[PDB]
Amino acid sequence: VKIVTVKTKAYPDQKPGTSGLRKRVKVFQSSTNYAENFIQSIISTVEPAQRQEATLVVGGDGRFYMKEAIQLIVRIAAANGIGRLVIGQNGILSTPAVSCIIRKIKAIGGIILTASHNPGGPNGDFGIKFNISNGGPAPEAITDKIFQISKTIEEYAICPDLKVDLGVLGKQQFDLENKFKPFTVEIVDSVEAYATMLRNIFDFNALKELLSGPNRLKIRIDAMHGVVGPYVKKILCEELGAPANSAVNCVPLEDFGGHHPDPNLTYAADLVETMKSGEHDFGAAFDGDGDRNMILGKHGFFVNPSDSVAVIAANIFSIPYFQQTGVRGFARSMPTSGALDRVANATKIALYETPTGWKFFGNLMDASKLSLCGEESFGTGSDHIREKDGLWAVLAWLSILATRKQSVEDILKDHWHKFGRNFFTRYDYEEVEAEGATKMMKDLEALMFDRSFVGKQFSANDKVYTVEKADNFEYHDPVDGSVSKNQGLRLIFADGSRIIFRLSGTGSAGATIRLYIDSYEKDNAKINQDPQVMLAPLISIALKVSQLQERTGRTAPTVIT
């Protein structure tokens, strides 16, 4: 094969985010050298002398355009000097799988091809997510160096001619012009090292007895035709012996079957109506790249992502991996509820509150300060890898069910009766007109920082909301030293009830108003009723303290999660 150089005109908008360069498919396929240029930028952050002894792990969630994009990574990685590429078979490799392989084979980094929950197809999204040597996402320091290069690029190296076969397992060797070392591509099974890792984490025998045996937990797993499909079939059906019909939508489709891979009650409605009938005992779903998870009990019983990390924390020793490794720290993102904190307090194990997004988690896990962690955005994880893991949260749940021999609903009533219930909901108030939102946060800040603000009692119908604290939350990272300022408006009432405001604004379309409400409760009687009734005073109070409709006109939430 020959190494030929292509002259190129650089780009203004290729700024990689904390989740890599995301853009609608059209940008990639119609814009001359868009992809080619970004791939060559990623590769160019790798210093020349290290290219030969290096192995990059490549692979994606399976959406449209994944394939010739991988074929681009190959020819550019090859001309560029990269010694070896370990690609999942047929390009498939889930996000938790790509971290697990990087970490395992001691690779320089991976190049995951996933637009995560954002849809796929000809007119849907795409994206090049770069991860680094520890298996986690590239840090700001690295993402921006990719940015400085994407913007100033003149020419990229390529082997036009080179075309590997993604279906065939095993090693393929190619000879590059005037190069004394061959370029090695290596096709790995997509599920094997990942299931091998899971095998030493969990007790697959206890589980096999639970899914196969006389008592047979009748589970229902929907994979929304995303990357987890193979992994669900292989690990739950073949190895654990789950009846083949337990796995729904487990075949990788390019457009995810014309739908959104978002694991939430709204988007994964199909699974939820099927779960309503009562046959099944357990249900669960995952997003695009499968590092997110939705847990469901008999008849549809929604286990809130916040309460969930807290249940796995309150039964963590039921898992073989925690019993031999030890739990050296608990953690969550600030908008996520206080349920994990009622568990974390009971123990002399550290608890960290952090801004939204894995790097925060990642840094503590590398600093050996965190073992189990969660998010309210349907995210759960541990230090076993360096990204979140959908399927690992479902299996931790099945291991608790196996040890406990209780239904999911009873597990939550026991949790809320020993720990107390943090009622939680989330109001997504989509895209508003800039000027109001900015004002409301400012008036509320002026109101919240007042000399007479704290100590004051607020009320409506039942509970008295005495303000014990107030601020606009910022974080000082203990590891890379960064300070993430103004992360969210915080309202803290003495019993534990909170209200968080998160303004994800864009000088492009408009600005998102996120209303997060954590309402704690400890009464034996008040706990078992519905959250919308139990949170209602605190929901209106949020509107009466912020004076929400007053500067926006918005009545209802676009999405309730």
Swiss-Prot record:
Name of the protein: Phosphoglucomutase-1
Residues found modified as Phosphothreonine: T114, T184, T466, T506
Highest rank taxon of the organism: Eukaryota
Organism lineage: Eukaryota, Metazoa, Chordata, Craniata, Vertebrata
Residues holding Mg(2+): S116, D287, D289, D291
Cellular component per GO, a single term: sarcoplasmic reticulum
Biological source species: Oryctolagus cuniculus
Phosphoserine PTM positions: S116, S133, S212, S368, S377, S484, S504, S508, S540
Family annotation (SUPFAM superfamilies): Phosphoglucomutase, C-terminal domain, Phosphoglucomutase, first 3 domains
Record-listed Phosphotyrosine modification sites: Y352
Residue numbers bearing the N6-succinyllysine modification: K418
Matches recorded under InterPro entries: A-D-PHexomutase_a/b/a-I (IPR005844), A-D-PHexomutase_a/b/a-I/II/III (IPR016055), A-D-PHexomutase_a/b/a-II (IPR005845), A-D-PHexomutase_a/b/a-III (IPR005846), A-D-PHexomutase_C_sf (IPR036900), A-D-PHexomutase_CS (IPR016066), Alpha-D-phosphohexomutase_SF (IPR005841), PGM (IPR045244)
Cofactor annotation comment: Binds 1 Mg(2+) ion per subunit.
Swiss-Prot/TrEMBL GO biological process terms: glucose metabolic process
Name of the gene: PGM1
Function: Catalyzes the reversible isomerization of alpha-D-glucose 1-phosphate to alpha-D-glucose 6-phosphate. The mechanism proceeds via the intermediate compound alpha-D-glucose 1,6-bisphosphate. This enzyme participates in both the breakdown and synthesis of glucose.
Group of enzyme by EC: isomerase
Residue numbers bearing the N6-acetyllysine modification: K15, K348
The entry's keywords: Acetylation, Carbohydrate metabolism, Cytoplasm, Glucose metabolism, Isomerase, Magnesium, Metal-binding, Phosphoprotein, Sarcoplasmic reticulum
Gene3D superfamilies tied to this protein: Alpha-D-Glucose-1,6-Bisphosphate, subunit A, domain 3, Alpha-D-phosphohexomutase, C-terminal domain
